[PDB]
Every structure is written in structure tokens, then in C-alpha cells.
Design a protein around this nucleic acid. Structure first.
Ligand SMILES: O=P(O)(O)O[C@H]1[C@H](OP(=O)(O)O)[C@H](OP(=O)(O)O)[C@H](OP(=O)(O)O)[C@@H](OP(=O)(O)O)[C@H]1OP(=O)(O)O
Ligand SMILES: O=P(O)(O)O[C@H]1[C@H](OP(=O)(O)O)[C@H](OP(=O)(O)O)[C@H](OP(=O)(O)O)[C@@H](OP(=O)(O)O)[C@H]1OP(=O)(O)O
Ligand SMILES: [Zn+2]
Ligand SMILES: [Zn+2]
Ligand SMILES: [Zn+2]
Ligand SMILES: [Zn+2]
Lengths: 350, 385
RNA sequence: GAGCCCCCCGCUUCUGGAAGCUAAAGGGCU
């Protein structure tokens, strides 16, 4: 099953780049349907403190998984644009309970593919080493933050590892805070790894680290947020020699609604590769514009007046679930999750 | 001491140990040995032996200290010396204090080496790094100079720079403006693993001691007295490589260091004539270890993986785990209950004096202008037992 | 200050040999 996911992602990337560390998100309409790559990203770098922007014109994490999520979010905005009464049947969204929000249809699902293991708790193992998590040592399961000048992470202006962010996705959903105003949380059906795959430490890293001490965490999670446990798999055949070849710091991102227009960024700074230093299309400003257009289209003038921080905090349910998940992580002994100052998110669109 | 004696002792010990073993040890090799001399008329006895020319890859590292991060001959030789020191500390007691190489120091808290006992080191070639940036045609002639005063030469700024043996690369490259921070998952994901050169390690021994950090609980630092090389010897290069490069900008570094930690200026020497048969290619990866307490037992390791060469890839007796086991045994024997409840990293950090000296030495190396020391990921030094 | 090539050093692919990569240390030419 995961071989088809990997080959689909590789074929899509090769076709788009005809004119590597590569992640993709794949939406499979039905079991018989092969599936289509919907979001695609590459990169291995993260910006530093000097490239941090208060007004949010720079992507603060050019890693592959993060940028694929940010392409998938743009794709979801596009699909919400396309939704109407006439095209309701042919879309992937259906009315949810209460009629206040839409929701993803049952048959359509999403899957994630990463060429290598996420940084953090997904590659803490040696040759010696239903979910089957592994908790043999006290140090295992701790939060780790990305280090500057490298792909690695160190245990706890600091950016959490890819594994911790995948855990946050598996608890609070993929859609983020803003799309909660119009959607229910969406969770990955499966996670596929190309290299550096350990079953015990991947399932512990992404889902099961909050189920170590029993089911005392799920009960406190208000619906519809759940502790997702996606199916975890590996590619059947793999390259033997680890690839140590030097890797460029360019990041390629694409979404299904963009046709054949890839965007290239440099992870050291987080802007489009060019002398003019164009604003990235996966940046905070473009996402806020896309949301304000969705709100204008949906006649929800209440959300227009809110800035990025105010609109993000407007989703009471999502923010309460986020705070509860952070507190649950701090309780079990994993260190404090770092959040950037609110002045970064307190920007008003022009 | 007459260097030819050190070389003959080392090679005779090797030949006797491997006189009738498997033919796989007939390839080219680099040999290092440590010799101890109890008095003036002592003929000399080998107390360690190591070989090999490789290191581990970034993939083969271990999170519980079950691998050896290096296999260069001098490194394995110093590890064997550490094992010998542990065994000799085991044998010590009140009855056999005179026959032992140790004597009580001021206050009796920690032992020290007898003033009549000395240690020498022989390497079959020049140590990699700052000690080998010159052609074999630059071979100086052997002179029996009575004076012990070194003669370092600082021809260019590039000389004196620190350097690492990168993985899957050729040569010995300085600590660049490469700010790649060594991390466990980062190295696993595919970055380059950089192990420090043997010349830098020998400088570290001369400034800190050959006993490491754990042994400093029970002993004062142990220093070397002579280094004998069998090829690629140059006085002005080797002297700066091992001990003089920390004294280039005056003696202000010496007064900063705190007794019993002091710089060491061992007598440098070269064998009378080199063995001209030094083939460049065909350098296999097997490594050999031998200590005095072992008797006739030699440990053969595959240098690429850092484990015992065999299908079972069992533990190496020079690995960090076995050294920690010996430390626990000695702490139990010496009624040191407080140290018995600490981890490897904390036990090394328990010795305030050695840690302070090591940090000061690294800071002095960086400030004076030779780069920054490259350390293994913290998840690899502080392991789980 | 730029460009080119001449030599010694740990890996992959077709007992031996051949090719390629690795980035440092000296040299020559315009
Ligand atoms: O860009 P992402 O990596 O996908 O996540 C960012 C951001 O994380 P980064 O700053 O590391 O990029 C926020 O995390 P913080 O570091 O700011 O704490 C996070 O959550 P918050 O914005 O609530 O802090 C999230 O937001 P969401 O919960 O909607 O997934 C999202 O923020 P943006 O998408 O607005 O940039
Ligand atoms: O090569 P070795 O002679 O065995 O030196 C190793 C080790 O070097 P490796 O990099 O090859 O593992 C450490 O060097 P770094 O990892 O820091 O670069 C260093 O350990 P410390 O810096 O923490 O002191 C040292 O320690 P010591 O001076 O006590 O001998 C010692 O460590 P081990 O004895 O544990 O192998
Ligand atoms: Zn990452
Ligand atoms: Zn799980
Ligand atoms: Zn060497
Ligand atoms: Zn000297």
C-alpha cells in the first residue's frame, strides 16, 4: 500500500520538475481509486533569529513536512472556494452536525509520505532496536527543538521538531486554527516513511507518546478532537548506502490548485529565490488573505474585523484543545512547548 | 630513551602476539605502543598495543556506548593503557604498596605515579593532522641531541589549525566555518561525521593526561615522556603538533592551567632508518588491541563499524560500556559509594578539576585562533546504563 | 586578484586492474 503512495509522490515530483528530501500529502477518494498527490514539498533548512519577521512575510520552517502541510492548507482553501450548492455532490465536503460547519466526507481520506524520518523523536534508535510504542528509557519521548545549521534537534526563537509538530497534527488536526471556523479537524489516515523507519519510536513519537500512562488524556479531550493513531508503514525496498551528498537549501512547494507553477524558497531566510525577494505564497500574509476572502465569500463579516491573532483566538474550541494538549504534554514530563510572542501574529492585512 | 629500542620492543611484542594467528594480519597496518620504564636499567616492557587506520560511520553510532568511535592505532593504544591502569589499581593494596607503580600523594585522597616510573609512546607513522603536512622527502636525519628544548616552526597561519577525519572523505580537513552542529538525529539523517585527528588528541593528552576523566578521581594526571616515530618525522612540525602549538603566543596559557594539570613536552625522536616499504594503497580496516593484563589475548575489531570483527558483533573490551563497568567495580572496591550511583556523563562531570581544565584548554585553543573542538552529540556521550 | 592542470592522501561502480567522487596541503602556466 505504501509503495503506491511513494511512487505517486515521486512521479508527481519528477513530472513537475522535468521542465532528495521530499514530503507529500495524498488524497484517496476511494479504496479502488489510486489517489492523487495534493500537496508537495521539499527542503531541510530552518530560518534563524535574524530572518524572523514580525509581520510574517517569511516561512519560519522550510522543512519538507511543514511545507507540505502549508500547501495542503492552501489546497483546502481552494476547495472551500469551489464549494457551492450545485457542486455539493461532486465535492469532498458535507454538512456536519448542527449545520454550522462543513466536514470532510467519510470516503475521502488523506495520507502523508516523507522520504526520511522526521527530526526529533523519530530517529532516536540504533541497529539494536495495533500500535506498539517503545518506552524503554526515561529520556525517550521528550520534546526537541530544531538547531540552527543542521537537520538535527536538541532536547529542551526556537522551533519544535518535525515529530512534535506531527504529534500536534495528530491531536489537533491538520487544518489549523483558521479553517476550524469552517471545518471539523482532519487527521491523517496513514504515515509512510522512506528512510529511517522504526515502528516503536515512530508510533511513540507521533501518536502514542500521550497514551503512555493510560487513557487519562483522551477523556479530557473535548469533542471532536481525538488522539488519532494513523497507520504507520514503510517502503518495501530501499536504497542501501545512506546518502551523504551535500544538499541545497532550496525549498520547492506546490499545491494541486497551482497547475505547473512551483515556488522556490531558501530555508536560511524563507523567501522566494530572487533578487526582488518576493513574498512566499505559503507565508502568513497569503494565508490570511485567502481566509479573509473565504470569510467575505461566506458572508461572515464578524471574522473580517479580527486580525490574525484575534481570528486565531476566536476559535474557542480549537484553542482550548491546544492548551489542554500542551498542558498534558507538560504534565507527563516532556518540557514546556515554546510559543512565539503574540506580537508576531498581531498584524493587520493592508 | 634510545628510540630504536622502543621500536624493536613494539614490533617484537606484535610479532610474538601474532606469530601464528590467521593470515589476515599480513596486510599493511599502522602500529602504536606504550612502553613503561621502571628505572634506569630497565630494558622496557610493552603495556599497550593498538592498530587500525579507520573510524566509524555516522550510521553505526550507538546510544548506549557499545561502539568505539575511532580505530587509529594511537587511540586504541591509549584505551589499552586505560585498561592497564584500571587493572593495576585493582591490584593495589596496603601490603603491596611498594611493588606497585603507585604511591600516596599529598593527603592520601588520590594516588599518583612513582617518580621512578615513566611512559613512552611509539607510532609507526606520523600522527594524522597537524603532524603530517610535509612530504616524505622532507625527512630530517636522526640526531642524538642531548638538549630537550623543542624547535617549533610556524611557517604559515594555516599550520596550527585543528582538523577532523571526515566520514567517506579523504584527507584531514580543518574545523571550517562549518557551523553544522553535531546532533544524533542529524547525523543519522545523513550529515557528515567528523572525528578529531590523532595529533589533536595527542595534544589533549599532553595538556590533560592519558588517564582520561573518570580515572582522575583516584589518580593525578599521567603524562608521557617520549614519542618515537617510524616514518614521516619532522621535528619542527611534530613538536608544534603535539605540545608547542599551545605556547606560541607566550606562557600566559601555562599559568592559567592549575596544578596537577600542566603542559607536557615529551622528547621527540625518530627511528634510525625507516622501512622503505610503505605501500600507499591496500589499507584494510581490521584493528587489533592488546593490554598487559590480557596476557596473550588480542581483540580484533572491524574499524568501520566499531565492534568486534565477527558475525555476532559482540561488545568490544575497549568500548565505553566496559570502561564504565571497570569504573563501577573499582568504585565498589575503594568504598566510593557516592560515585556508584551516577551515570557516565555525570560521573565524568563529577571530577570538577578535570572538567575545569578541559574546558579551559578548549577555550584557550579557540581564543588563540586554531578553531573549535568538535564534540559528539550529547545523546551519545551521556548514554544509558 | 582571476582562471587552468601536476603530483601524495577515505569511499562507490565494472584476485587484479580501470573509472568517478570526497576537500586539504605545496607547485607550475596565462
Ligand atoms: O508553520 P507551522 O510550523 O506549520 O506552525 C505554525 C506555528 O509554528 P512555527 O512558528 O514553528 O512555524 C505555530 O506555532 P508557534 O511556534 O507560533 O507556537 C502554530 O501554532 P500557533 O500559531 O497557535 O502558535 C501553528 O498554528 P496552528 O495552531 O493554526 O496550526 C502555525 O501557525 P501559522 O500557520 O499561523 O503560521
Ligand atoms: O577517541 P578517544 O581517545 O576514545 O576519546 C574519547 C572521545 O573521543 P571520540 O570523539 O572519538 O568519541 C571523547 O571525545 P569527544 O567525543 O568529546 O570529541 C572524549 O570525551 P570528553 O570530551 O567528554 O572528555 C574522551 O574523553 P576522556 O578525556 O575522558 O578520555 C574520550 O571519551 P571516552 O573515554 O568515553 O571514549
Ligand atoms: Zn525536520
Ligand atoms: Zn499511536
Ligand atoms: Zn591518524
Ligand atoms: Zn614541545
Amino acid at each position: 500500500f505504501h509503495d503506491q503512495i511513494a511512487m505517486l509522490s515521486h512521479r508527481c515530483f519528477n513530472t513537475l520538475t522535468n521542465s532528495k528530501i521530499l514530503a507529500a500529502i495524498i488524497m484517496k477518494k476511494d479504496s479502488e481509486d489510486m489517489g492523487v498527490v495534493v500537496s508537495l514539498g521539499t527542503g531541510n533548512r530552518c530560518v534563524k533569529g535574524d530572518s524572523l519577521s514580525l509581520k510574517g512575510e517569511t516561512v519560519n520552517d522550510c522543512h519538507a513536512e511543514i511545507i507540505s502541510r502549508r500547501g495542503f492548507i492552501r489546497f483546502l482553501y481552494s476547495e472551500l472556494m469551489k464549494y457551492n450548492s450545485q457542486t455539493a455532490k461532486d465535492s469532498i465536503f458535507e454538512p456536519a452536525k448542527g449545520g454550522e460547519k462543513l466536514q470532510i466526507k467519510k470516503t475521502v481520506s488523506f495520507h502523508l509520505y516523507i522520504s526520511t524520518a522526521p527530526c526529533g523523536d523519530g530517529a532516536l534508535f540504533d541497529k539494536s532496536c495495533r500500535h506498539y510504542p517503545v518506552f524503554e528509557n526515561p529520556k525517550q519521548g521528550k520534546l526537541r527543538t530544531k538547531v540552527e545549521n543542521g537537520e538535527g534537534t536538541i532536547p529542551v526563537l526556537r522551533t519544535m521538531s518535525c515529530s512534535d509538530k506531527i504529534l500536534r497534527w495528530n491531536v489537533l488536526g491538520l487544518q489549523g486554527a483558521l479553517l476550524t471556523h469552517f471545518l471539523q479537524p482532519i487527521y491523517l489516515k496513514s504515515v509512510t516513511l522512506g528512510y529511517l523507519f522504526s515502528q516503536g519510536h515512530l508510533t511513540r513519537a507521533i501518536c502514542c507518546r500521550v497514551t503512555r500512562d493510560g487513557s487519562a488524556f483522551e477523556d479530557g479531550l473535548r469533542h471532536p478532537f481525538i488522539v488519532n493513531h494513523p497507520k504507520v508503514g514503510r517502503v518495501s525496498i530501499y536504497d542501501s548506502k545512506r546518502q551523504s551528498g551535500k544538499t541545497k537549501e532550496t525549498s520547492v512547494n506546490w499545491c494541486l490548485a497551482d497547475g505547473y507553477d512551483l515556488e522556490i524558497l531558501d530555508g536560511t531566510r524563507g523567501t522566494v529565490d530572487g533578487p526582488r525577494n518576493e513574498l512566499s505564497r505559503v507565508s502568513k500574509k497569503n494565508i490570511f488573505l485567502l481566509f479573509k476572502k473565504l470569510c467575505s465569500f461566506r458572508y461572515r463579516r464578524d471574522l473580517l474585523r479580527l486580525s490574525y491573532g484575534e481570528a486565531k483566538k476566536a476559535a474557542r474550541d480549537y484553542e482550548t484543545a491546544k492548551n489542554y494538549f500542551k498542558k498534558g504534554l507538560k504534565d507527563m514530563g516532556y518540557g514546556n512547548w515554546i510559543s512565539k510572542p503574540q506580537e508576531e501574529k498581531n498584524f493587520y492585512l493592508c
